[PDB]
Amino acid sequence: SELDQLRQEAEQLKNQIRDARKACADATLSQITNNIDPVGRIQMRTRRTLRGHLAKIYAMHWGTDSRLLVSASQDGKLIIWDSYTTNKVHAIPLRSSWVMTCAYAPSGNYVACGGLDNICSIYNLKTREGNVRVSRELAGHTGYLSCCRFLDDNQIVTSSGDTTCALWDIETGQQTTTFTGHTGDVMSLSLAPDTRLFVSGACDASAKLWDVREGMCRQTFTGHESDINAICFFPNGNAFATGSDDATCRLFDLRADQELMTYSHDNIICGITSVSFSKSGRLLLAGYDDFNCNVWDALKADRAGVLAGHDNRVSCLGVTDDGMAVATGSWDSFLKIWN
Amino acid sequence: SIAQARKLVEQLKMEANIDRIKVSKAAADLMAYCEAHAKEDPLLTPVPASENPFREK
Amino acid sequence: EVWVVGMGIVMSLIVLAIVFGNVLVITAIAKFERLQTVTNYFITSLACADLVMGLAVVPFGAAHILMKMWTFGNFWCEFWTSIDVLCVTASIWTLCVIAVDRYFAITSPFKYQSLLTKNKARVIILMVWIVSGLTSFLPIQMHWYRATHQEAINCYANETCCDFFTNQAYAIASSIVSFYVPLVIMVFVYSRVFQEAKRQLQKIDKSEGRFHEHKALKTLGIIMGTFTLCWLPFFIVNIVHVIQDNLIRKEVYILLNWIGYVNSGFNPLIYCRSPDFRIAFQELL
Amino acid sequence: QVQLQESGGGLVQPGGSLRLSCAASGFTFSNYKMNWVRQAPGKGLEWVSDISQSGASISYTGSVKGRFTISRDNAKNTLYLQMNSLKPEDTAVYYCARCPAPFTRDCFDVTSTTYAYRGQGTQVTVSS
Amino acid sequence: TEDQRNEEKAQREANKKIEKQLQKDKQVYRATHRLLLLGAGESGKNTIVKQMSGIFETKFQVDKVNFHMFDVGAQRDERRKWIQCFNDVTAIIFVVASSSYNQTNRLQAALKLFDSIWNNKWLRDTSVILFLNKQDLLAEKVLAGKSKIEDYFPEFARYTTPEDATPEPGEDPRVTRAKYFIRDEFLRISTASGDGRHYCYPHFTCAVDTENIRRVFNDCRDIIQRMHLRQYELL
Ligand SMILES: CN[C@@H](C)Cc1ccccc1
């Protein structure tokens, strides 16, 4: 009848897409990169330890100047740190103790936060006198805020645990666009270098590529076997890396529209919470649930080093725009800056 | 019910017909990008302590 | 010659064991930030007192015993006694402070988590050493402890001898202050802690006992079975040999005092056997 | 792409038996604990049974103990449910649900209205 | 470098005030206890709130100690992600309507949810205070010919009331037997893999006025004492 035909058509389309993807699999990255000299061994030491948070930290974000950074903890605090001198530039108390994400504006005049209140709060840091106060409260999501990234000082893209993403205009306070299509909570998002596209990973073992202007999904990637927690673009914007609860990382290309490389090992049976790239994209840094961080050769898929200085879950990880240092946060309420 | 199936079918139809390139070309592009910017990576190639901002305690 | 060689070997082994045990705890606490807690401050104070005892007290006593002579002058004779008294008093009062800390943590769960911070712990630790320093150096170096009998006067003026003669008003005031009051306080607080522990096991069996004292007595018997076993023998003789004469030979007095010295080599084995301390000790060396 | 396809079902006289098969692809079958869930007409999802990675632990609801049986073949990546004695209250759509994550002792969201790692389901009716 | 020295100094006395304020706030943070109120709309979860928009706040004072209760609302029924945010609360209050023993199977769903919460890897240290609401409705349904308990729990007919059971006076053995069977269903899961790091505290509540906050206070006191006793190798 009317039903049971759409399902068969969808299955046929899935088979056609799979065949088209298979027809493009000329070779593999490992075969091509056989002549590449190995990276070797990466030995990083903790250059700074930042203390002052009372509860576990979920989020951090570097500044464009590669010197200041914001961190969010469920003690009810956003702390803005100077990395070079380990001082404290700002301390902002939050109306809701439950915060899951934080962002830092590229200009540096604003920060953003959100969590188990379905509201994104924007904080102005360049007031003429007084202190930091809420300038905008974007509301309308029906689920907890998972991630938020700034586009200029008037636009922001947020992901929510209501299976939808949103693009908001800050001045009016109304969301310009809604991105639908995921069947699970959207856990992370990453902006392209040109800020024209972005990618999101959901709790359905899938990732999607969205165009900001049109508001529609262009490509979908399904290689993982469990929930996706982290996602990050390659420096040139033609690829991206994802991490999940199945304990593997995967590199997906956009032109080829399929997976290129997998980063996993037999002795790792814990999920991956954070993903980041190096300045040149040669090293891929991943935070794990076993209280450790790993460094992978992004072209040869062999582990190159371990960041082992945290006593609890590693929740957030970030690399500066200069590429000099890597900052990691954990559930033990300390930040660590490595070089 | 019917609406979600229709949306899924439309999305699959529109995603089916997109131009692609070979895996070798994408791998070569990634290799070229990684090799071109090797000198500018501070983490990959260690930086002398003179110009390291975090080295001085 | 065999007797003195064996005695020297035993004393050297005791000194090495004490210093090796009491250096590792401090190094681990200083290194690992996970082992930095309010209680660990008291543990560090106790370990420092034991280390000072093992460095500046035991070797000098061993040299005095083996050589049967005090080579140093009269100034180093009175200085050594003051540091000995200071070390023993500080160690005993640190143990009492740890006992009171546990008592307050268990008996008043709500007030403890807020009232006691890292600032007040350091004030208490400093207050313990200030009082012990004033009750050890002042009564000794101001000559309030000298005895009035003939034998004491001979050794007081003579060099080469460092026998500890005390009058009846110092062997009782010092013993009560240093040992007996902390003993009573610790006995009371651990009695209350043990009573509190039994009430919690009587609520887990009454609630979920159909599904599936030994540990409380074992852990509280080790603490009360080595401090009392190592210090009670000395502090009874210390009063008896002054209240009445000729009952205790000086060899017994020396031997019983040295039994209380090895209690400093057992302290890290009681308060530093937690899994965190075990993994910290495994990480280094 | 994780796929769970259910088989079996149909119309069966009271007292009859049915064998339901669940073919799983796209993930490592050995590392996950599997569940059989069902939804009756005009009702919500009900957890029916579950089995662990190696089959050591098996659980049922009180309305199916003694009658229903669950099993898994890890070599062929298949989940089997055998229904020996059937009642008119067993008419429902049966789904084959999967644990959200591997190597975990818990399963949070398997009877939810929406859930990613669940199959299409098969209709089972026992009327007359 | 005079300007550099001036800005560095300004940075130092800017950090000093922030650190002073953080030290002030640490005492307030350490001196309050966070509770996670869970359950379902059918199970009540609001009459508890009555006697003390994505989350709701409640605050109450017991013997001059602070309690904060968190009601999770306006959230989807996928709790496998946002539950991890409540892994350092002192207690999770789990409310279950034991009267609805006849989705239409509330008790089995509650048992499965409790098992999932208990066996979570990030909730291995969190204790649960279990409230079994609507006992009067359960008594009315058991006394009347509404439904049979062994239709969903066939092992109930082989259940004998434990001797330690102390029913309130003026009762019938059937309602006591049903109540204790339901309670032991949760206690089995609680005792299967507790390992002494956390416990479960089941209570029977019908209409008690201001006694629920007293029960929560007593159970939190017990939780803290047991944690302190365990960390000292003493319990
Ligand atoms: C005998 N004077 C004790 C009260 C103190 C003491 C303890 C040990 C060693 C020497 C001295």
Q: Domain spans of chain D?
A: 3-121
CB-nearest partner of A246 from D102, D114, D116: D102
Burial class (CB in 10 A: 0-12, 13-18, 19+), A23: exposed
* A185 touches A146 (CB < 8 A): yes
* E62 touches E213 (CB < 8 A): yes
Give residues (CB < 6 A) around ligand 1.
Answer: C 84-85, 88, 164, 174-175, 178, 238, 257
CA A240, A241, A245, A248 torsion-angle sign = positive
Q: Which residues of C touch E233 (CB under 8 A)?
A: 215, 219, 273-274
In total, the C-beta contacts within 8 angstroms joining chain A to chain B are 149
In DSSP terms, E71 is beta-bridged to E37, E56
Terminal-residue alpha carbon distance, chain D: 40
Would you give the DSSP letter of residue C272?
A: S
CB spacing of E229 vs C215 below 8 angstroms: no
Q: How many CA atoms lie within 13 A of A32 on its CB side?
A: 19
What does the alpha-carbon distance between residue A260 and residue A74 come to, in Å, rounded to a whole number? 38
> Where in the sequence is the domain holding A151, given as residue range(s)?
1-338
What are D93's two structure tokens?
Answer: 């759509």
What are C264's two structure tokens?
Answer: 């400093």
What does the alpha-carbon distance between residue C87 and residue C91 come to, in Å, rounded to a whole number? 6
CA E219 to chain centre: 10
Contacts of E35 (CB under 8 A, 6+ apart): E67, E68, E69, E70, E89, E90, E91, E92, E93, E216
What are E44's two structure tokens?
Answer: 């009540």
Distance between Cα A24 and ligand 1 center (Å): 88
Instruction: Kindly calculate the radius of gyration of chain D based on its CA atoms and give it in whole angstroms.
Output: 14
Q: Residues of C forming the annotated binding site for (S)-carazolol?
A: 84, 174, 257
* A257 touches B22 (CB < 8 A): no
Helices (H), chain A: 5-23, 29-32
What does the alpha-carbon distance between residue E138 and residue E101 come to, in Å, rounded to a whole number? 8
Contacts of D111 (CB under 8 A, 6+ apart): D37, D44, D45, D46, D47, D97, E103, E109, E112
A338 to A69, E91, E157: CA distances (angstroms): 14, 37, 64
Place of tokens 């007192």: C49
CB spacing of E80 vs D108 below 8 angstroms: yes
Element (H, E) at C266: none
CB spacing of E119 vs D105 below 8 angstroms: yes
Give the pairing of strands A186-191 and A46-50.
Answer: unpaired
CATH fold group of domain D3-121: Immunoglobulin-like (2.60.40)
Could you tell me which chain E residue has the CA closest to the CA of D42?
A: E103
CB-nearest partner of A91 from E22, E72, E80: E22
Query: Looking at ligand 1, which residue's alpha carbon is closest to its atom 6?
Result: C85
DSSP character string of A263-287? E--TT--S-EEEEEE-SSSSEEEEE
DSSP character string of C46-76? HHHHHHHHHHHTHHHHHHHHHHTS--S-HHH
CATH architecture of C2-283: Up-down Bundle (1.20)
Domain extents in chain C: 2-283
* A32 touches A266 (CB < 8 A): no
Q: Which residues of E touch A67 (CB under 8 A)?
A: none
What are D32's two structure tokens?
Answer: 């996950």
What are C97's two structure tokens?
Answer: 């402070």
Query: CB contact, 8 Å: D113 with chain A?
Result: no
Torsion on CA atoms C179, C181, C187, C193, rounded to nearest 10: -120
Atom of ligand 1 nearest to the CA of C57: 9
* Three-state secondary structure readout of chain D: CCEEEECCCEECCCCCCEEEEEEEECCCHHHCCEEEEEECCCCCEEEEEEECCCCCCEEECCCCCCCEEEEEECCCCEEEEEECCCCHHHCEEEEEEECCCCCCCCCCCCCCCCCCCECCCEEEECCC
Side chain identity at residue A280, one-letter code:
S
What does the alpha-carbon distance between residue D65 and residue D62 come to, in Å, rounded to a whole number? 6
The CATH number of whichever domain residue A280 belongs to comes to 2.130.10.10
Could you tell me which chain A residue has the CA closest to the CA of E30?
A: A54
Element (H, E) at E134: none
What does the alpha-carbon distance between residue C134 and residue C126 come to, in Å, rounded to a whole number? 12
Q: Which residues of D touch A183 (CB under 8 A)?
A: 114, 116
Contacts of C9 (CB under 8 A, 6+ apart): none
* Three-state secondary structure readout of B4-47: HHHHHHHHHHHHHCCCCCCHHHHHHHHHHHHHHCCCCCCCCCCC
Nearest CA to C37 among C110, C102, C86? Answer: C102
A72 sits in the region (left: phi over 0; alpha: psi -120 to 50; else beta) called beta
What does the alpha-carbon distance between residue D97 and residue D69 come to, in Å, rounded to a whole number? 16
What does the alpha-carbon distance between residue A274 and residue D123 come to, in Å, rounded to a whole number? 42
Place of tokens 């944690």: E227
Helix C250-259 vs helix C214-243: crossing angle, to nearest 10: 150
What does the alpha-carbon distance between residue A262 and residue A273 come to, in Å, rounded to a whole number? 16
Helix C58-67 vs helix C2-31: crossing angle, to nearest 10: 180
Q: Do chains A and D touch (3 or more CB pairs under 8 A)?
A: yes
Report residue A207: phi and psi, to 5°.
-130, 150
Neighbours of chain B (3+ CB pairs under 8 A): A
Q: Which residues of E touch C117 (CB under 8 A)?
A: 27
What does the alpha-carbon distance between residue E19 and residue A92 come to, in Å, rounded to a whole number? 12
Query: CB contact, 8 Å: A37 with chain B?
Result: no
Side chain identity at residue C118, one-letter code:
K
What does the alpha-carbon distance between residue A245 and residue D101 come to, in Å, rounded to a whole number? 6
What does the alpha-carbon distance between residue A289 and residue A87 come to, in Å, rounded to a whole number? 29
Distance from CA of E208 to the nearest CA of D (A): 32
Give the pairing of strands A68-73 and A57-62.
Answer: antiparallel
Element (H, E) at C256: helix C250-259
Domains in chain A, number: 1
E20 to A52, A132, C121, E6: CA distances (angstroms): 11, 18, 19, 21
E193 to A64, C208, E125, E200: CA distances (angstroms): 49, 13, 12, 12
What does the alpha-carbon distance between residue A146 and residue A59 come to, in Å, rounded to a whole number? 10
CA C102 to chain centre: 18
Helices (H), chain E: 2-30, 47-50, 106-118, 135-143, 173-192, 211-231
Which of the listed residues C230, C231, C257, C258 should we mutate to test ligand 1's pocket, taking the one with most ligand atoms within 8 A of CB? C257
Would you give the DSSP letter of residue C177?
A: I
Distance from CA of B8 to the nearest CA of A (A): 7
Instruction: Kindly calculate the radius of gyration of chain E based on its CA atoms and give it in whole angstroms.
Output: 23
Q: Which residues of D touch A222 (CB under 8 A)?
A: 1
C140 to A112, C153, C273: CA distances (angstroms): 67, 16, 37
Contacts of C145 (CB under 8 A, 6+ apart): C139, C166, C167, C170
* A66 touches A84 (CB < 8 A): no
* D61 touches E105 (CB < 8 A): yes
CB spacing of D109 vs E154 below 8 angstroms: no
Terminal-residue alpha carbon distance, chain E: 61
Nearest CA to A158 among E163, C29, A144, B37? Answer: A144
Report residue E96: phi and psi, to 5°.
-135, 135
A25 sits in the region (left: phi over 0; alpha: psi -120 to 50; else beta) called beta
Nearest CA to A137 among A94, A86, A191? Answer: A94
Q: Which residues of B touch A84 (CB under 8 A)?
A: 53-54
* C148 touches C158 (CB < 8 A): no
CB spacing of E116 vs D104 below 8 angstroms: no
Side chain identity at residue D34, one-letter code:
M
Helices and strands (H, E) in chain C, number of each type:
13, 0
* E39 touches E49 (CB < 8 A): no
Nearest CA to A66 among B49, B45, B54, B40? Answer: B54
What are C277's two structure tokens?
Answer: 């301390």
What does the alpha-carbon distance between residue C278 and residue C34 come to, in Å, rounded to a whole number? 13
What does the alpha-carbon distance between residue E166 and residue E49 come to, in Å, rounded to a whole number? 28
Domains of chain B from N-terminus onward: 1-57 (4.10.260.10)
A279 to A234, A319, A325, E72: CA distances (angstroms): 9, 8, 10, 41
Report residue C156: phi and psi, to 5°.
-65, -45
CB spacing of A16 vs B2 below 8 angstroms: no
Nearest CA to A233 among A271, A261, A194, A199? Answer: A199
CB-nearest partner of E79 from D45, D47, D108: D108
* A119 touches A138 (CB < 8 A): yes
Nearest CA to C105 among A203, B35, E226? Answer: E226
Indicate which of E20, E29, E228, E231 best probes the interface with C, i.e. most C CBs within 10 Å of its own CB. E228
Q: Do chains B and E touch (3 or more CB pairs under 8 A)?
A: no
What does the alpha-carbon distance between residue D4 and residue C80 come to, in Å, rounded to a whole number? 82
What does the alpha-carbon distance between residue A145 and residue A117 come to, in Å, rounded to a whole number? 8
Neighbours of chain A (3+ CB pairs under 8 A): B, D, E
- So what CATH class is E32-231? alpha beta
What does the alpha-carbon distance between residue C22 and residue C45 come to, in Å, rounded to a whole number? 11
